[model samples]
Target chain A: GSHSEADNYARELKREQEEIIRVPDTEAAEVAEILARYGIEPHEYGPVVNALRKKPQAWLDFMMKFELGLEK
Target chain B: GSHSEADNYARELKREQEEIIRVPDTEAAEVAEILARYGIEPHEYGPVVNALRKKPQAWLDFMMKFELGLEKPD
Candidate 1:
């Protein structure tokens, strides 16, 4: 329950959390274009937005390998 | 070298071509709904219609399964 190493583990956990957040926003544009191809104009997007804003877990899952997913 | 079976084969081929043409038009409304999901507003789909009518095959392919495919995942 009490150890100096707890701080180290805490720092590592913090880094993981920061990483999760940082990576998702890095590809805002690519997703914008993907919506373009799908013809999904953004403004009429609540269900889609809901699914995205649902949680950091699903949101992060979505943003992961997502921006990296544009090819023929 | 050949028999009456050739006529049957030709008739079968004709049916195949007709089937391709007929089945594609069967679900016009379903595709309209799918486009709704992608946010392509119906009232704003004039140019989209023009783009589709510009080419028969691609449009059909676009509408294929296209819920109708993307409308057929081409």
Candidate 2:
């Protein structure tokens, strides 16, 4: 586990990347959930969701950072 | 709400800032949990947890992003 953690975390990155490509709407909902629970009003949700959608990698990175608490 | 999300998101940041200040151990534990569920091994958890300890904002941002799912929401 010492030097092999690259795979450990990298696999996580791939997991999210796949979800973004296949289930964007679901992922978009997750973004809304993430924002809403954090106190965003329902009405304000669309812009942020759509904003992240502009770039797939940004969306994937955003979700992985939230769900997995990863930065790499 | 459209033109005034500043308070909406700013408050979320305050919430996390307080938690990081008040309960670092709990926050650290959260870091461990976030990484753990996402497939990181238990043995490898300590290093990542401690790494964030050196910077409170980094740790706070890390957890707020996970638990609250907020970049600014937290």
Candidate 3:
């Protein structure tokens, strides 16, 4: 680590990580809503952000694997 | 099976296959610890939880492409 832990996470968090394709705004908005709940706003995130935003369905599937109660 | 025997392998870990977002304060706390260990925090977690709660079933897709414990094979 060159500077600090904060810098490390930030470096990873906002790296030139990956590429993304366009998606439906409805989907994006739904994703935005999810991200918003998690204190993640669109401006702070990038394209790869858009890709991972489609995680609720996958998360729900993941959650269903263990029968963990869902808030919604 | 001998190649992957339970005892031969390093025993067991709680492998909860499916879990939902009703993350209890304790489980939430554990997750917080994980985020904290990685140096991410509530300013990071809050809005997403709030959004998911409001929307019912929103997914978190921010894998970031890179790894969380992103280590290259050394």
Candidate 4:
């Protein structure tokens, strides 16, 4: 009870994380291939996927904010 | 109906608490409020809300005894 709470919480959190968090491997690989079609190196393509996947909600929010601003 | 009983235990427990299990909007307010804060208000909350709202005394005993040492203030 006094030791290894990190492992306990980590195991429990990981179980719950599976229920909530999601990552799309197929889309990520497709995006990487698209970047390669334009002669972009795989290393150079890293940041593009990172930007898209890591902050998809932020991008959506930005689009919504600007698009709604246009309508208003 | 009483002639053939296979998977039926045929014993009623907590007959008193079963009568007033639906206590309107009283005990589940804070529980629902906290659940709503994280947007888990709708789907997963039904069991919790109903469990607290009209719950039998047996449920209260188990919930308080088990979770009180962990989540609630002692």
Candidate 5:
């Protein structure tokens, strides 16, 4: 019974994740560089981008920060 | 110039994923079963749960749906 649950959950998660586009490692690095003006390296900011796939405002927020970092 | 950007992005994403806790496959299945009572399977619902780790209201909404499903259990 438990095995059935485990199997189903794994399969389901696989299905959901499969459709979400992943930024290629190369592209991710480029994006990260753009974010580094404020010491926010790619590693530090990547998850916020990944999580806010459905929230474009978050990207805007980050970009705004980047712009401010540049002006400084 | 470009390479630096790309490298940073990858490293950042890696760091983020590393810090988040992953539901064990077994526990994930049980959660999926609880969700499936509403015709929602694990694969279809897992990301929402994963994404909403920072959003408790999302999980609460899911649980509310599950409870409603239990009442109907068709």
Candidate 6:
């Protein structure tokens, strides 16, 4: 049973990503407003969000495009 | 007897976000590369990542800013 350590690590990452919790309504609505700005309808938003969770840099890149200084 | 489910849900979300894992060196380097482009030091990147997890929609809005379609549902 030669389980590659890398494969084990990747699987563990996948497991963490699958975990979920109910989002606050107000937070969801605020996200919807921004999504609408980019022409992303509410129904189609979930996968993109999940994708960011998988690759966080993508989310950082996406935010930088706004130039709104999210840290503020 | 006024336990707001909303409060419970938010607390749970916070707990999950605090969970951690050892990021692979390659993956961490990749993320660091992107963070560098934004003038964000690798040291400060953790809080931003944590913030996005707390507000998943923030993650959604962040991605939509790129205007790339992401769907492969059955």
Indicate whether candidate 3 or candidate 5 has the larger lDDT. 5
Alpha carbon lDDT at A30, candidate 2: 89
Candidate chain B TM-scores, in order: 0.42, 0.76, 0.35, 0.36, 0.33, 0.39
Docking class of 3: incorrect
> How high is each candidate's TM-score?
0.31, 0.49, 0.26, 0.28, 0.23, 0.26
Query: Per-residue lDDT for B45-70 in model 1, tens only?
Result: 43344444445554444443232112
Candidate 6 deviant stretches above 4 angstroms:
A1-65, A68-72, B1-33, B66-74
For B13-52, candidate 2 gives per-residue lDDT tens digits of 8887888888988888886676555444545446545556
Q: Residue-wise lDDT of candidate 4 within A1-72, one digit each (tens)?
A: 465657765555454334324645654565556434434455544654555455544323222222122111
lDDT per residue for candidate 4 within B3-59, as digits (tens), equals: 764321221223223433554353355445543443343444455445444434534
* Candidate 5 lDDT over residue span A38-70, tens digit each: 234344445544543444333333332232221
Cα shift from native, residue B64, model 6 (Å): 1.8
lDDT by residue for model 5 over B1-74, one digit each (tens)? 54445453345444434433354343335545643443444554465445444444333333333222211124
lDDT of 6 at B47: 44
Clashing pairs in 6: none
Which model scores highest in DockQ? 3
Q: Positional deviation of A71 in candidate 4, in angstroms?
A: 45
- Off by more than 4 A, model 3: A1-72, B1-23, B59-74
Residue pairs with backbone overlap in model 2: B13-B74
Q: What is the DockQ score of candidate 1, to 2 decimals?
A: 0.05
Model 5 docking category: incorrect
The residue-by-residue lDDT of candidate 3 on A1-72, one tens digit each, is 269767754454333122112333444444345335444456543332343345434423222221222222
How many Å off is the CA of B52 in candidate 1? Answer: 1.4
Greater DockQ among 1 and 6 belongs to: 6
The superposed Cα distance between candidate 6 and the true structure at residue A18, in angstroms, equals 46
lDDT of 4: 0.40
lDDT of 2 by residue, A17-36 (tens): 88888998999888777545
Mark the 10 consecutive residues where model 3 chain B has the least summed lDDT. B63-72
Q: What's the lDDT for all of these models?
A: 0.44, 0.67, 0.35, 0.40, 0.40, 0.42
lDDT per residue, candidate 6, B7-35, as tens digits? 53354444433332233343335434554
